[PDB]
Amino acid sequence: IETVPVKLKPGMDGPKVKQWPLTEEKIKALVEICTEMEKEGKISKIGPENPYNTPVFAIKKKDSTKWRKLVDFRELNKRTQDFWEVQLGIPHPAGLKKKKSVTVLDVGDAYFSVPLDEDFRKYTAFTIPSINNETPGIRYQYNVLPQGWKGSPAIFQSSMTKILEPFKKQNPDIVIYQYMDDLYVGSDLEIGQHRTKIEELRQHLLRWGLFLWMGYELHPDKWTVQPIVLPEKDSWTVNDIQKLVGKLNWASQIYPGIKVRQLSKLLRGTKALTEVIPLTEEAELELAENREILKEPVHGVYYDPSKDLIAEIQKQGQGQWTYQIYQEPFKNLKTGKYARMRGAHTNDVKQLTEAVQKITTESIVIWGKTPKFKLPIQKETWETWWTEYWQATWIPEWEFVNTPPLVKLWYQ
Amino acid sequence: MVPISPIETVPVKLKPGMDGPKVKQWPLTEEKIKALVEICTEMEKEGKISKIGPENPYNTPVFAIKKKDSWRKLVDFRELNKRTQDFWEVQLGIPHPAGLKKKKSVTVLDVGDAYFSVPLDEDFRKYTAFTIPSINNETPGIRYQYNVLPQGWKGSPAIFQSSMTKILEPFAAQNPDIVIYQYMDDLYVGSDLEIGQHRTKIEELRQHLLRWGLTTPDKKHQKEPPFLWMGYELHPDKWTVQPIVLPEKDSWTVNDIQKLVGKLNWASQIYPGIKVRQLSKLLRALTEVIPLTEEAELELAENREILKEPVHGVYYDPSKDLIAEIQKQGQGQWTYQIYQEPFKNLKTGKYARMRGAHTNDVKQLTEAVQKITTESIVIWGKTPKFKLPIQKETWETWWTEYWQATWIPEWEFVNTPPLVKLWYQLEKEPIVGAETFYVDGAANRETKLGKAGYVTNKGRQKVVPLTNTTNQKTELQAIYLALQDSGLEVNIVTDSQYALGIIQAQPDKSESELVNQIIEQLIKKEKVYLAWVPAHKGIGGNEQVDKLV
């Protein structure tokens, strides 16, 4: 019933981010949605004395025919004070990524029960735009905790903690994690009893006083990892050996004692690319020693919570995508590969967007925050289309790579 | 007295840490002072302003200007504007005629009266204080403050529009058979209603506006179709740009071309086929006369041919489909038309390639499509169906083999040359039977002297010496040599990541004459396999030794 005081960082004014064009279908949904949220006191109309603005649009969650409102609080979030709570900083549950099955819940409606600080409400202003700027946009501001904002989980954390107490004392093995509007619940239980404990939990939430019906089941214990592998051939062409040396030369930036001398000695002379070359003894040994090295982990690879996670993604063709998460170059914390077919067989951008979401979800489970993406796509193509395929309640950061990386085939 | 509804004031504050204006009032002639006093006397009598005591320390300069040698009052609010908070300006982004819908009747009403019915925030009025200097400076000058939104103030246009909108809002929502739009001191109402019903709706609107004490001049407004609005011409059933006149000159300065490009840019939204590159490639000193190239003069001659006759755009019909068609014009220029019915454009437009070192037609096409797509969502709220000069098979080959992710929304092939094609396509695997060329280049950083060349499996060799060059040019030169001296099928091995990065980007055109020559060589080939190896790793073939000298 009482609001917790919220302010911004010293020297920073509220967000003034342009609203980007929305389609007719998304505008109608946002109008229909904001009409009801105003009747529920969740939002209120505002005037021209409010200069602040934050983009907004509409999505459909995983297998649903009902629109969801999504606000891009990325600017407000990096401008709102580093909201430390009475928690002194929650240590990210390192057992979450070890559980057999993790389900992800949407507890966003829970935030709508807690009021927002009056002096801070002006900063959550957003515009429902009109087609062709015919009518003026409809301006609203939030009166409660908004979905997407960084302060919403922090503030509600005091409330959320004592809501799940009867469930946590009863089930002391289940690991529960909260990021933004999503609740991550992992367990070693069988999927059948898992879905019941989940259904028990959402009924335990509905009873306490709070669309929380949709579930997103992961499997961290079955998650993809990638060591560096070299080919095993009975006959090597000059081209085969040339690609091998290239890959080993690159891997030497990562691993210490990688040698290519004996292998290069095979390439001496000017031969045809398709000419078969028999390996010498010293060469097979060198290749053997190099395999050994690659099997061991990378030396000195740690995670620093004070640094940014960076994700790089390569298009491999035929629907496959590789990716690497790191903080330091050649110091990969995580690598992976995709080949999904979720209705994107003829669309690169939809695949990339699902890839970015899948990688972000993984990143939240492992380290408890989102990576800075580096996408193999022109800025203009991505900015035109990513909202049409986005289904996650959060939004990572991203930049764009325009020069073809040579290291594309060394990860395939 | 019929009770009129009050208009909600908007809470206005000054920027944080700042304070109101304290500008000295300029001395005025006895002529001007007399004029201002009379004006401010009736303004006070109308309620627009009020006299204030000596307590107020804020001041804003007020001037008097002869209304074309006939007096007008002018308060200089520049200092207050710099110190006033930011507002949510709503005019940002005017409507585009191609997105509007045809109307049988469009009436105009004057809203000059309702402006002074919008009150200013009580705690902010003190900031609008100004002084009427006294005759001979022998009395304390007359002090006034505003009670309504002052002309010229930063917040006036925003507060006025938001107050007008809030009033018109229930009328618009309950009368969906009409449309209302506001343009500075004037209201525009349009409908497809029977003309009899239309005149009534205007009267209903006037009656509705009366609730807030807002009176229209109760007369048939002189303003009638066509309307001149924001550079456009609005007709009931169509629209166009205000007449574009290309001036005849023997001498064109820098400024004249800017006036020429600007008009061409503005006219390109309805006049199809307008080119501007050869006129924009001259502005790469507004009084400086620049010689017009023969290639640019031929473009201007084509411009006058298109601007020969007036062309009109139609309005948007939500019940029909939306179609965008693109054509390549050359020199990185693209033009497009958007229509619903054949030969009846809603609007037109053009796209120019971004400034880069290298590029190809497929990339530019994609960029044009995205631009049109973004524009079309702004204007119509949906994506048009595309007609593109590129074969389906060409697009499939391109995007399934391109390192970046790319996408074009629903589209069909239209066969109107020049068609967009892929000119060359590198192999994925080495070519059996084809001669293998190991190439390399090197250059002395100081003397700028360098060498380029190759060696092959068949024993073929070449090394050429080069002057005034760099490591990057000699690496490219080496590949060009291999292309020149090889058959229709060839394997090329290089250690240059720079050269590979360029050819993997697949340009069909470039700034560098070197790269262009390579492209012309690639085009002539049947099969080309490019392979990369690391340098200095003792990989035989990779003959740095022939270039190290």
Ligand SMILES: Cc1cc(/C=C/C#N)cc(C)c1Nc1nc(Nc2ccc(C#N)cc2)nc(OCCCN2CCOCC2)n1
């Ligand atoms: C921007 C604008 C400028 C001016 C004048 C400026 C000056 N000076 C006047 C108006 C009224 C508007 N606003 C507007 N104008 C149109 N059309 C239109 C056509 C011709 C002319 C002329 N001549 C003028 C306007 N259409 C819409 O919205 C489409 C709704 C579709 N309807 C809804 C009802 O059921 C049926 C479908 N809004």
